[PDB]
């Protein structure tokens, strides 16, 4: 069994972001890639998220 | 002379060994010929088996 992404979403992916995995298996004696990959939508929060209210509301 | 110029005796296992090699391929199930596995549903008999 493989270890799965077990990864923090960072801020740099804050913006929809992609993940691609992949493996070469040698096989009998010929390779070839295998590869796969994903869409990660990661909910556009800022990184600055800058909060600006009128104090006197 | 009598045809004894060899002589085998059994044996405890007193220590294991080393499998035998690994098959990358398909296994022919009474010969255990390694074949790859494009020679299967070949049309031909690449076992001898």
């Given at each position: 069994s493989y270890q799965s992404i077990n990864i923090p979403v960072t801020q740099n992916m804050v913006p929809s972001s992609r993940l691609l995995v992949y493996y070469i298996v040698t096989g009998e004696q010929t390779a070839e890639l295998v590869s796969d990959s994903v869409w990660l939508n990661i909910?556009?929060?800022?990184?600055?998220q800058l909060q600006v209210h009128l104090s006197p509301d | 002379c009598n045809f004894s110029d060899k002589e085998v005796e059994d044996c405890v296992t007193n220590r294991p060994c080393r499998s035998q090699v690994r098959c990358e391929g398909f296994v022919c199930a009474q010969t255990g010929r390694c074949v790859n596995r494009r020679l299967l549903c070949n049309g031909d008999n690449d076992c001898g088996d």
């Open positions: 909910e556009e929060k800022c990184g600055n | -």
